[PDB]
Write a protein that binds this ligand. Sequence first.
Ligand SMILES: *[C@@H]1O[C@H](CO)[C@@H](O[C@@H]2O[C@H](CO)[C@@H](O[C@@H]3O[C@H](CO)[C@@H](O)[C@H](O)[C@@H]3O)[C@H](O)[C@H]2NC(C)=O)[C@H](O)[C@H]1NC(C)=O
Ligand SMILES: *[C@@H]1O[C@H](CO)[C@@H](O[C@@H]2O[C@H](CO)[C@@H](O[C@@H]3O[C@H](CO)[C@@H](O)[C@H](O)[C@@H]3O)[C@H](O)[C@H]2NC(C)=O)[C@H](O)[C@H]1NC(C)=O
Ligand SMILES: *[C@@H]1O[C@H](CO)[C@@H](O[C@@H]2O[C@H](CO)[C@@H](O[C@@H]3O[C@H](CO)[C@@H](O)[C@H](O)[C@@H]3O)[C@H](O)[C@H]2NC(C)=O)[C@H](O)[C@H]1NC(C)=O
Ligand SMILES: *[C@@H]1O[C@H](CO)[C@@H](O[C@@H]2O[C@H](CO)[C@@H](O[C@@H]3O[C@H](CO)[C@@H](O)[C@H](O)[C@@H]3O)[C@H](O)[C@H]2NC(C)=O)[C@H](O)[C@H]1NC(C)=O
Ligand SMILES: *[C@@H]1O[C@H](CO)[C@@H](O[C@@H]2O[C@H](CO)[C@@H](O[C@@H]3O[C@H](CO)[C@@H](O)[C@H](O)[C@@H]3O)[C@H](O)[C@H]2NC(C)=O)[C@H](O)[C@H]1NC(C)=O
Ligand SMILES: *[C@@H]1O[C@H](CO)[C@@H](O[C@@H]2O[C@H](CO)[C@@H](O[C@@H]3O[C@H](CO)[C@@H](O)[C@H](O)[C@@H]3O)[C@H](O)[C@H]2NC(C)=O)[C@H](O)[C@H]1NC(C)=O
Ligand SMILES: *[C@@H]1O[C@H](CO)[C@@H](O[C@@H]2O[C@H](CO)[C@@H](O[C@@H]3O[C@H](CO)[C@@H](O)[C@H](O)[C@@H]3O)[C@H](O)[C@H]2NC(C)=O)[C@H](O)[C@H]1NC(C)=O
Ligand SMILES: *[C@@H]1O[C@H](CO)[C@@H](O[C@@H]2O[C@H](CO)[C@@H](O[C@@H]3O[C@H](CO)[C@@H](O)[C@H](O)[C@@H]3O)[C@H](O)[C@H]2NC(C)=O)[C@H](O)[C@H]1NC(C)=O
Ligand SMILES: *[C@@H]1O[C@H](CO)[C@@H](O[C@@H]2O[C@H](CO)[C@@H](O[C@@H]3O[C@H](CO)[C@@H](O)[C@H](O)[C@@H]3O)[C@H](O)[C@H]2NC(C)=O)[C@H](O)[C@H]1NC(C)=O
Ligand SMILES: *[C@@H]1O[C@H](CO)[C@@H](O[C@@H]2O[C@H](CO)[C@@H](O)[C@H](O)[C@H]2NC(C)=O)[C@H](O)[C@H]1NC(C)=O
Ligand SMILES: *[C@@H]1O[C@H](CO)[C@@H](O[C@@H]2O[C@H](CO)[C@@H](O)[C@H](O)[C@H]2NC(C)=O)[C@H](O)[C@H]1NC(C)=O
Ligand SMILES: *[C@@H]1O[C@H](CO)[C@@H](O[C@@H]2O[C@H](CO)[C@@H](O)[C@H](O)[C@H]2NC(C)=O)[C@H](O)[C@H]1NC(C)=O
Ligand SMILES: *[C@@H]1O[C@H](CO)[C@@H](O[C@@H]2O[C@H](CO)[C@@H](O)[C@H](O)[C@H]2NC(C)=O)[C@H](O)[C@H]1NC(C)=O
Ligand SMILES: *[C@@H]1O[C@H](CO)[C@@H](O[C@@H]2O[C@H](CO)[C@@H](O)[C@H](O)[C@H]2NC(C)=O)[C@H](O)[C@H]1NC(C)=O
Ligand SMILES: *[C@@H]1O[C@H](CO)[C@@H](O[C@@H]2O[C@H](CO)[C@@H](O)[C@H](O)[C@H]2NC(C)=O)[C@H](O)[C@H]1NC(C)=O
Ligand SMILES: *[C@@H]1O[C@H](CO)[C@@H](O)[C@H](O)[C@H]1NC(C)=O
Ligand SMILES: *[C@@H]1O[C@H](CO)[C@@H](O)[C@H](O)[C@H]1NC(C)=O
Ligand SMILES: *[C@@H]1O[C@H](CO)[C@@H](O)[C@H](O)[C@H]1NC(C)=O
Ligand SMILES: *[C@@H]1O[C@H](CO)[C@@H](O)[C@H](O)[C@H]1NC(C)=O
Ligand SMILES: *[C@@H]1O[C@H](CO)[C@@H](O)[C@H](O)[C@H]1NC(C)=O
Ligand SMILES: *[C@@H]1O[C@H](CO)[C@@H](O)[C@H](O)[C@H]1NC(C)=O
Lengths: 147, 147, 147, 332, 332, 332
Amino acid sequence: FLEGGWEGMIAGWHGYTSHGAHGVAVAADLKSTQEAINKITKNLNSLSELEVKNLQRLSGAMDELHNEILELDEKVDDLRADTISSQIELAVLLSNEGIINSEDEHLLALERKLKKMLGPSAVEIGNGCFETKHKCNQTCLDRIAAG
Amino acid sequence: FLEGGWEGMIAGWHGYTSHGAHGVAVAADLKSTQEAINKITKNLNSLSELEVKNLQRLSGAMDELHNEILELDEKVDDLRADTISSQIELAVLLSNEGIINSEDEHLLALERKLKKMLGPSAVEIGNGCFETKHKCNQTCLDRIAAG
Amino acid sequence: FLEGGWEGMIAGWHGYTSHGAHGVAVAADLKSTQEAINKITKNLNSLSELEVKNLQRLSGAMDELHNEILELDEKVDDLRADTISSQIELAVLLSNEGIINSEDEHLLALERKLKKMLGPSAVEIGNGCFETKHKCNQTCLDRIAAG
Amino acid sequence: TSSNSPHVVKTATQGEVNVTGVIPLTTTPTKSHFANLKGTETRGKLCPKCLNCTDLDVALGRPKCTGKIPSARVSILHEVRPVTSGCFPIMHDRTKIRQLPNLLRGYEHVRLSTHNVINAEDAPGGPYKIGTSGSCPNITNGNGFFATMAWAVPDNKKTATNPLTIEVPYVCTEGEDQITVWGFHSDNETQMAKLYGDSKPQKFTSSANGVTTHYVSQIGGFPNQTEDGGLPQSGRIVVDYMVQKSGKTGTITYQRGILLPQKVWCASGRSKVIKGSLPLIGEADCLHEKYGGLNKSKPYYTGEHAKAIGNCPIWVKTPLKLANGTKYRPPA
Amino acid sequence: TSSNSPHVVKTATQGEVNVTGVIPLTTTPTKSHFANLKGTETRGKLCPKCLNCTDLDVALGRPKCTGKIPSARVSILHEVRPVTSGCFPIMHDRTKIRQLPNLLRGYEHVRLSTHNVINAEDAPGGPYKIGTSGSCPNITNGNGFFATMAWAVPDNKKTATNPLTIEVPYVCTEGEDQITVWGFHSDNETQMAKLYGDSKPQKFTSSANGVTTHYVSQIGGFPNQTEDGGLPQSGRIVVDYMVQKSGKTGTITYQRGILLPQKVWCASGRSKVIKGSLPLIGEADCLHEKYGGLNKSKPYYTGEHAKAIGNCPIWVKTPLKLANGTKYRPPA
Amino acid sequence: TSSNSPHVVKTATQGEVNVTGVIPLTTTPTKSHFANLKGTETRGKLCPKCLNCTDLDVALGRPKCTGKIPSARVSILHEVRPVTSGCFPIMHDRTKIRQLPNLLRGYEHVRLSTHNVINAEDAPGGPYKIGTSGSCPNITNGNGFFATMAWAVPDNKKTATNPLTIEVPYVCTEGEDQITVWGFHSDNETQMAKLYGDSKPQKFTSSANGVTTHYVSQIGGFPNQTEDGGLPQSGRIVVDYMVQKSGKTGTITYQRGILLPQKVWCASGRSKVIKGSLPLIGEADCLHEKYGGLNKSKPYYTGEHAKAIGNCPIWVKTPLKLANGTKYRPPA
Ligand SMILES: *[C@@H]1O[C@H](CO)[C@@H](O[C@@H]2O[C@H](CO)[C@@H](O[C@@H]3O[C@H](CO)[C@@H](O)[C@H](O)[C@@H]3O)[C@H](O)[C@H]2NC(C)=O)[C@H](O)[C@H]1NC(C)=O
Ligand SMILES: *[C@@H]1O[C@H](CO)[C@@H](O[C@@H]2O[C@H](CO)[C@@H](O[C@@H]3O[C@H](CO)[C@@H](O)[C@H](O)[C@@H]3O)[C@H](O)[C@H]2NC(C)=O)[C@H](O)[C@H]1NC(C)=O
Ligand SMILES: *[C@@H]1O[C@H](CO)[C@@H](O[C@@H]2O[C@H](CO)[C@@H](O[C@@H]3O[C@H](CO)[C@@H](O)[C@H](O)[C@@H]3O)[C@H](O)[C@H]2NC(C)=O)[C@H](O)[C@H]1NC(C)=O
Ligand SMILES: *[C@@H]1O[C@H](CO)[C@@H](O[C@@H]2O[C@H](CO)[C@@H](O[C@@H]3O[C@H](CO)[C@@H](O)[C@H](O)[C@@H]3O)[C@H](O)[C@H]2NC(C)=O)[C@H](O)[C@H]1NC(C)=O
Ligand SMILES: *[C@@H]1O[C@H](CO)[C@@H](O[C@@H]2O[C@H](CO)[C@@H](O[C@@H]3O[C@H](CO)[C@@H](O)[C@H](O)[C@@H]3O)[C@H](O)[C@H]2NC(C)=O)[C@H](O)[C@H]1NC(C)=O
Ligand SMILES: *[C@@H]1O[C@H](CO)[C@@H](O[C@@H]2O[C@H](CO)[C@@H](O[C@@H]3O[C@H](CO)[C@@H](O)[C@H](O)[C@@H]3O)[C@H](O)[C@H]2NC(C)=O)[C@H](O)[C@H]1NC(C)=O
Ligand SMILES: *[C@@H]1O[C@H](CO)[C@@H](O[C@@H]2O[C@H](CO)[C@@H](O[C@@H]3O[C@H](CO)[C@@H](O)[C@H](O)[C@@H]3O)[C@H](O)[C@H]2NC(C)=O)[C@H](O)[C@H]1NC(C)=O
Ligand SMILES: *[C@@H]1O[C@H](CO)[C@@H](O[C@@H]2O[C@H](CO)[C@@H](O[C@@H]3O[C@H](CO)[C@@H](O)[C@H](O)[C@@H]3O)[C@H](O)[C@H]2NC(C)=O)[C@H](O)[C@H]1NC(C)=O
Ligand SMILES: *[C@@H]1O[C@H](CO)[C@@H](O[C@@H]2O[C@H](CO)[C@@H](O[C@@H]3O[C@H](CO)[C@@H](O)[C@H](O)[C@@H]3O)[C@H](O)[C@H]2NC(C)=O)[C@H](O)[C@H]1NC(C)=O
Ligand SMILES: *[C@@H]1O[C@H](CO)[C@@H](O[C@@H]2O[C@H](CO)[C@@H](O)[C@H](O)[C@H]2NC(C)=O)[C@H](O)[C@H]1NC(C)=O
Ligand SMILES: *[C@@H]1O[C@H](CO)[C@@H](O[C@@H]2O[C@H](CO)[C@@H](O)[C@H](O)[C@H]2NC(C)=O)[C@H](O)[C@H]1NC(C)=O
Ligand SMILES: *[C@@H]1O[C@H](CO)[C@@H](O[C@@H]2O[C@H](CO)[C@@H](O)[C@H](O)[C@H]2NC(C)=O)[C@H](O)[C@H]1NC(C)=O
Ligand SMILES: *[C@@H]1O[C@H](CO)[C@@H](O[C@@H]2O[C@H](CO)[C@@H](O)[C@H](O)[C@H]2NC(C)=O)[C@H](O)[C@H]1NC(C)=O
Ligand SMILES: *[C@@H]1O[C@H](CO)[C@@H](O[C@@H]2O[C@H](CO)[C@@H](O)[C@H](O)[C@H]2NC(C)=O)[C@H](O)[C@H]1NC(C)=O
Ligand SMILES: *[C@@H]1O[C@H](CO)[C@@H](O[C@@H]2O[C@H](CO)[C@@H](O)[C@H](O)[C@H]2NC(C)=O)[C@H](O)[C@H]1NC(C)=O
Ligand SMILES: *[C@@H]1O[C@H](CO)[C@@H](O)[C@H](O)[C@H]1NC(C)=O
Ligand SMILES: *[C@@H]1O[C@H](CO)[C@@H](O)[C@H](O)[C@H]1NC(C)=O
Ligand SMILES: *[C@@H]1O[C@H](CO)[C@@H](O)[C@H](O)[C@H]1NC(C)=O
Ligand SMILES: *[C@@H]1O[C@H](CO)[C@@H](O)[C@H](O)[C@H]1NC(C)=O
Ligand SMILES: *[C@@H]1O[C@H](CO)[C@@H](O)[C@H](O)[C@H]1NC(C)=O
Ligand SMILES: *[C@@H]1O[C@H](CO)[C@@H](O)[C@H](O)[C@H]1NC(C)=O
């Protein structure tokens, strides 16, 4: 239901699962949810903000009359196109490598703050969902999700 | 023998050392060993797959007759060569920075899965080799190395 | 005084705070302090060491007489300038992203070595300053800061 | 959280990976019409208000095609090989004159001069009368000729001459290039004898900024008339241009049949020029050579690379996607 | 695991670090022979089947050097300064003709035309007979001349003339450039008088696509014969070429001694051209200007940068290595 | 540790962040004087020891401006449009001669030849006497002329002639380009008749490496004298140059008034050339076109991009800063 995954609702795209004996209390951390959205927004903008100069024709190079110069001009435009495309691909690929490799830090950070809020009472393995030594109801879980 | 290092066999290039009172049981995680090989293979290929357009002569620029155009053409080829070399060096240097800085995560990840398999019985410092509160023989260690 | 921060002395730019019942013993890890300085120095140098070829005029292209070639030459110099600037900005931006994101590893690494030196006696949350189960005076703290 | 996550993104070192959501960064533009670039003045024809004129008639000063050329920062190269639509028959392919309008459009500011560069009547070769043609009607429908040239026909003493030299002064202001249009007339043997007095082929040269040329006229045997006023003519003209870089004078050498420079073009600055096709319809944020106007819906595009002007998407080799979500985590 | 680990790799921010294993990414090529590029047709000589001919004899249509030029996408510029090996003595360094073959090799498809562009016998200057030479033997060992030119010698009325003009038609199909070869003959005073009727220096011009030239013949006093059929001659020829961009005609102006265009070259597409040296031995994945054929054993190379064609390693400034292992961990 | 930390640095993916300390990587240079590049020999004037001479007087061999040109690897283009300061009046703007010195400065090694390329006295056109001028005083204050040209005036038989041809030999060593300076004289009708015997306009041509030109002299009606010895003259000269690429000869065609080549320039290698302004004051690590000498205090700079030579900072678009410290941590 909360761990592993199933074809449920992903509307709060929540980063951690609930725990406890009170049936299955569920609450979402919407501060975390907004952080993730704002973070991707900033990354998208640093890429969409890239500006390069555009290419145009040489104003003094007339067709036919200066065909040799123009052949070189085409070569320059074409080589430049590979260069800029490669810089963009690297910027995007590095952005994605960074995003992909931030997956574990985000999840580990969430478990660490649960320990801060819950205290030195427990450890967990595998998925690692922190589990308490006391019962916590929906009101309790909402307070935790909200800090 | 297992910690620090010596001029022994490195054939399984193993990421963790054994522990326990049963003499010195030794087993290798060959899943981990293959992951490391497959990971470097993928990185090598993303670099060897780089394709850039090659440079050639301007077809309409004749020697001597159009020497001035050709001087510029040489300038273009030469500047392009620095540009591509620099992009490659950065891609390689970033790949190496990423590889070098993945050393601790690989080792920490290995110790974390040993804790998953062994349970919340112990901690360790310095090299951090997890050590149990129970005896584990070679058959036991092989089961652990194999999951 | 040590946590959070105030308008005090930052001369040893120290990475961790002290703990203990002996008033407020304070000692700095100057090995850590030098590591941080040497690390930034190396990064600064890998950037200041970038070398690219410089641009000059075509030796055979005379003003007016070969104005069309020269217009293209200016285009080439200008496009090259964007290309090199972009490579530098990326190298610098990646260097800064790496520096900014190394903040937590540096602090976590410092707390881990305190645990190595102090033993498996305690945990802490929030700022995480390790706190002992025994009194440690200024001489004790100096030995810890010094290893 | 996890969902059905088959989206694929690439990383620099891990090759391809599966993720739970992506943000496409690229699009593929669809070819459309050229449009005015938004904000910046865009030049189509050299003189948008010179009706029943084309760029080469305007460039040559054809009667009734004169007028102001608007300044512009962006120009579209509508005609690769400009043509004429009137006045005297021109043997266009003998010179480089068809590209004159494509030179003028490359300047930000283009104006025709206010005074004749050369006194055509009083010039080496003797007193001249200035010729007109029924093919080049003026604003009162009389017989005119190109504003940029004087057809200098000897008044008297219709004899053969030796090459004569005129230094063509620089009359534009500093910083402006001066483009001088000049040329020559030729006819069959009978008319050359009646009009100039010398039926043999005439020779002409020109020089500016170290660049020189040479022409020899053709006597009789002319090619069929195209791109002109429609009246039959026995003769033809050859028209060329000389470019005088700012501060320099040029030189013209001639015998009989010279069309002397009169008004000249003064021009400065630089327009951004791309190839394209008129009419310009509406406005666009970017003008692309292959795709016409674009509005940059995505920061990057895939497709055919070409020159462009404006707030353009950047061409890239492949589709690009950012990961938005985490790696695919199958429901296990 | 740790081993003796002195391998050094560089990182972007940590400078140099010691690792337990590396993967060299670069090599250093060793200069070898040029080879056919693997897969793609590679052009060496213009006509590989025209024996005892060089590229300039083929380009000029020397008798017995005619034939088909194979199309190719890759060409090697074997001769920087092409030479001839037969037919009439040519004062090669008076014009730009030595580079003609290097222009033809730059096209993907090159063919000589099937029909004469100009009727040489019936042309301005009066009826001509077409000259031949003992230096230019044909396939039946009679006296021929270059296929691309007609040596037009007046049949009668051997008098001096005024410059005459021929418009050279475009005969290639759309999209093909037309390269016209033309030239002139000159001799000493005695022979000019017997052959053409005018011993003074003759003048010639040409024009295409705005590009013009001018020549004046030399009478007598010719340079020593080289690169020709070996028979002594009192005269010499000057050969040039004109390039007519697709759709355009060109113009030739001449007096006596004109070698009129006959067959012309039609060409299209573009070959990839690098400098190199024949013979081509075997095949290679990449052809490099400094190193000859290469087979890309490593993705990058160090060494001297130069142009290349094919599945080439990418030049880099330094040796490059990936770390394969971890940082060096001394046995402590 | 934390401090007041408003410094802002940018990252590739997080946009802008606040840090506790930065290292500026960029500076903004201040325009200063040009200077000798440190270490490498820098060329200012072509002949620093030829006093009361400018680069065009040195290039033309003006009497008393001859001498050795130091080799240099770095050159500064002091005069965009070089001028003369003495000897015979030159109609500079008729040709491309003003740029001759800017061609010579582009070579690493430039020397004037030791022997005349052409025997001027014995040449086509008949025995010549070599002309001198009061405007061109030599080292003993007699009448000289440019070292690079012989003013060839017929000794006797002062008649009109037909164009004559001289092949100009290559006299430089292999690898050197040979730059030949030649020209022609012209005068009013009276003096042409007394000096050459032919008052009509004379024609000249030249050819090298496929590049050709043509000139027609002007008879009388000359422009006002500038940039010369100061004595009045009725005539004027036209001076041009021909560049013969290594191993090739060139050709000059002429009638009367020819200034024949004598000494020629031999040159090789390449200098690094930027635009600038003399005098050079002191030394600098980098010479920039807009900023003069720079000493690279920071690895990068912002400001106006331009060409440069030396150990230069690299131009970047924005100020750049490294983070030195951690992110800002407000005192909480
Ligand atoms: C359109 O073209 C016509 C001619 O094709 C121009 O008309 C001509 O204008 C000139 C200048 O005013 C007249 O010249 C003068 O003629 C008188 C005759 O007595 C003479 O005494 C003067 O010394 C001078 O030569 C010319 O005769 C007149 N021709 C005709 C047929 O009217 C007309 O001005 C042009 N229109 C425009 C707007 O340019
Ligand atoms: C050279 O060009 C001129 C034109 O500038 C040609 O002259 C023209 O020749 C035609 C005949 O072929 C003449 O037409 C006739 O005119 C009379 C006039 O009374 C009329 O009665 C006839 O019914 C017919 O229309 C025309 O007038 C004449 N025009 C001029 C200005 O002379 C000349 O023939 C050409 N010569 C060569 C060798 O090509
Ligand atoms: C780029 O964006 C511009 C701005 O949205 C697009 O041009 C605009 O297109 C609309 C629809 O064709 C025009 O609306 C018209 O308004 C008049 C008002 O009287 C109305 O009568 C018409 O029926 C219609 O609704 C709008 O005026 C026009 N804007 C401008 C400045 O001309 C443009 O097409 C987009 N181009 C691309 C490549 O996406
Ligand atoms: C190789 O060159 C020789 C000449 O150097 C060519 O032979 C010549 O061919 C022409 C055309 O068939 C002959 O012209 C005709 O001569 C008869 C003579 O009665 C005349 O009645 C015709 O009106 C016409 O002028 C010419 O005489 C002949 N010359 C010789 C010496 O045989 C030969 O055809 C060329 N071979 C090839 C493959 O091109
Ligand atoms: C201009 O060029 C022509 C060649 O096209 C030169 O004519 C040749 O002159 C030589 C003598 O120097 C003649 O050789 C002699 O021929 C007779 C024939 O009976 C023979 O008995 C002698 O033993 C000797 O071989 C040659 O035949 C003649 N050829 C032609 C076609 O005329 C001419 O001398 C040159 N003139 C100048 C001013 O350079
Ligand atoms: C790039 O790789 C190609 C392909 O391996 C290399 O060319 C090949 O070289 C071998 C050895 O020289 C040739 O083998 C010969 O086969 C004949 C078969 O009858 C045998 O009689 C000979 O004794 C010999 O064993 C092979 O044919 C040839 N392949 C081709 C397509 O020509 C090439 O040399 C490598 N180039 C570089 C730069 O490394
Ligand atoms: C500076 O220019 C003057 C002339 O403007 C040069 O003086 C001239 O030098 C030549 C060569 O030595 C003298 O020619 C000879 O004259 C004698 C007279 O009897 C004659 O027999 C010889 O056959 C030969 O023609 C010429 O007379 C002399 N002129 C004058 C006025 O002295 C002077 O040499 C030049 N200085 C330098 C350093 O180049
Ligand atoms: C063509 O150029 C020549 C110069 O090379 C001009 O000749 C010069 O004409 C002036 C008069 O305008 C002469 O001045 C007079 O000389 C006599 C000598 O006895 C003196 O007594 C007078 O007081 C006065 O100074 C000058 O000598 C003469 N020089 C030469 C070398 O002939 C000629 O007039 C010009 N012709 C044309 C059509 O432009
Ligand atoms: C780049 O760095 C060089 C080297 O520091 C700067 O040139 C140097 O400037 C100093 C001060 O102007 C010169 O010192 C002088 O020494 C003489 C010794 O007799 C003394 O009499 C003077 O009063 C003065 O102290 C020094 O000689 C000079 N070095 C050289 C090689 O000329 C240069 O100005 C800096 N340029 C830039 C763009 O920053
Ligand atoms: C990145 O993915 C998230 C998750 O799907 C997108 O945010 C959702 O937007 C819809 C819009 O109707 C909302 O109903 C959902 O509640 C949002 N989900 C969450 C977890 O907040 C987001 O728009 C995507 N961003 C981009 C640039 O594509
Ligand atoms: C990266 O390093 C590993 C470790 O040396 C290489 O793998 C070894 O290959 C030999 C081949 O005979 C085997 O006998 C060893 O058992 C392998 N070791 C391990 C730990 O698997 C690997 O080939 C290197 N990769 C590259 C691209 O150089
Ligand atoms: C990076 O920041 C540190 C911290 O401010 C700088 O080091 C200080 O330098 C002053 C020099 O008088 C010393 O008094 C301080 O004690 C140093 N502080 C520490 C923590 O060592 C360092 O110079 C800066 N580096 C760069 C390149 O700007
Ligand atoms: C990672 O991505 C690849 C490509 O998206 C997945 O491989 C393909 O998955 C589709 C699913 O419909 C199959 O039809 C194809 O046959 C698969 N390709 C191959 C070569 O087998 C891959 O499965 C994804 N990773 C995970 C964990 O599912
Ligand atoms: C990191 O690499 C450097 C270079 O590989 C090592 O420094 C050199 O090591 C060799 C070993 O034979 C010595 O002979 C040289 O004298 C050393 N250079 C200098 C300047 O002292 C360095 O030792 C390596 N790091 C470690 C931990 O060993
Ligand atoms: C991060 O940096 C930005 C820019 O340095 C800070 O925003 C500005 O801070 C100054 C401080 O004097 C205010 O006067 C401005 O009004 C602030 N800008 C805006 C748009 O409000 C920002 O505060 C910094 N982050 C933190 C935690 O302080
Ligand atoms: C000339 O312009 C008018 C409009 O002013 C138009 O009706 C006419 O058709 C045009 N003539 C030609 C030949 O295009
Ligand atoms: C030129 O015009 C005449 C009619 O005046 C026509 O018969 C001839 O075919 C035309 N020639 C060409 C090439 O169009
Ligand atoms: C001409 O070709 C034949 C082979 O067909 C060859 O034997 C002969 O040597 C060649 N002649 C020359 C001059 O190279
Ligand atoms: C030209 O040939 C003659 C023999 O016919 C020879 O004596 C002379 O030296 C040769 N000249 C050159 C420059 O080779
Ligand atoms: C010529 O040089 C001297 C120094 O040798 C100088 O005094 C004189 O003023 C200079 N003459 C001119 C016209 O510059
Ligand atoms: C040329 O010089 C004369 C004096 O000899 C002077 O009157 C005239 O104005 C000058 N012309 C020019 C264009 O400077």
